[PDB]
Structure formats: structure tokens, C-alpha cells
Amino acid sequence: NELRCGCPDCHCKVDPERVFNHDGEAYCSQACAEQHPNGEPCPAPDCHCERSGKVGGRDITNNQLDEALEETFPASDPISP
Ligand SMILES: [Cd+2]
Ligand SMILES: [Cd+2]
Ligand SMILES: [Cd+2]
Ligand SMILES: [Cd+2]
């Protein structure tokens, strides 16, 4: 039932109670979750992952975001909890 880190170059135990997800993937920490965007390694002192793959400088981190409205506030408001 242990979760596994998405970083192949990383050696960490991902707890099912503290798994950092990214796009549906499991990671040891949010550090690896972003696949080292600033070359920042995971928060493990014995681990040395940062030059994984061909990451040079940064990655293409751009969100398409959500455009399913912004809760339009009209005069007649729906039932509030
Ligand atoms: Cd690591
Ligand atoms: Cd790690
Ligand atoms: Cd990791
Ligand atoms: Cd890593």
C-alpha cells in the first residue's frame, strides 16, 4: 500500500498518508512533483536527484487553468450551505 515516487532518479518512500500528487502521479514531495522546476532536489538529505533526464534550467510549466465560470453573483442567489 506504499506510494511510489514519480521521479525515477529519486530514492524515497512515499507514504499513502503524505503522498504529493501531480497530474494524478505520486511523488515523495511537492519538490519532485514539479519534476525539479528550479533544479531544486527533493527534501531528502541523502538523496541527490536534480539532473534527471534532460532538464536544463527549467521545464515548460504552464497551466491551461480552469474557465468553468467564477460563480457569477446574480440578484437571485442559490441555496447557500
Ligand atoms: Cd530524491
Ligand atoms: Cd525523494
Ligand atoms: Cd522524489
Ligand atoms: Cd527527484
Swiss-Prot record:
Residues where Cd(2+) 2 binds: 10, 42, 47, 49
Cite the InterPro entries for this sequence: Metalthion_dom_sf, Metalthion_fam14_prok
List positions binding Cd(2+) 4.
5, 10, 28, 32
Q: Where is this region: Disordered?
A: 60-81
The species this protein was found in = Pseudomonas fluorescens (strain Q2-87)
Q: Where does Cd(2+) 3 bind?
A: 7, 32, 36, 49
Record's function text: Metallothioneins are small proteins that have a high content of cysteine residues which allow them to bind heavy metal ions through clusters of thiolate bonds. Preferentially, binds four Cd(2+) ions. Also binds three Zn(2+) ions but with less affinity. Required for long-term viability. May play a role in the storage or sequestration of metals when present in excess.
Q: What turns on this gene?
A: Up-regulated during the stationary phase.
What's the superkingdom here? Bacteria
**One Pfam family per UniProt:** Metallothio_Pro
Residues binding Zn(2+) 2: 7, 32, 36, 49
Q: Which residues bind Cd(2+) 1?
A: 10, 12, 28, 42
| Any one GO MF annotation of this record | zinc ion binding
Q: Which family does it belong to?
A: Belongs to the metallothionein superfamily.
Protein name according to UniProt: Metallothionein
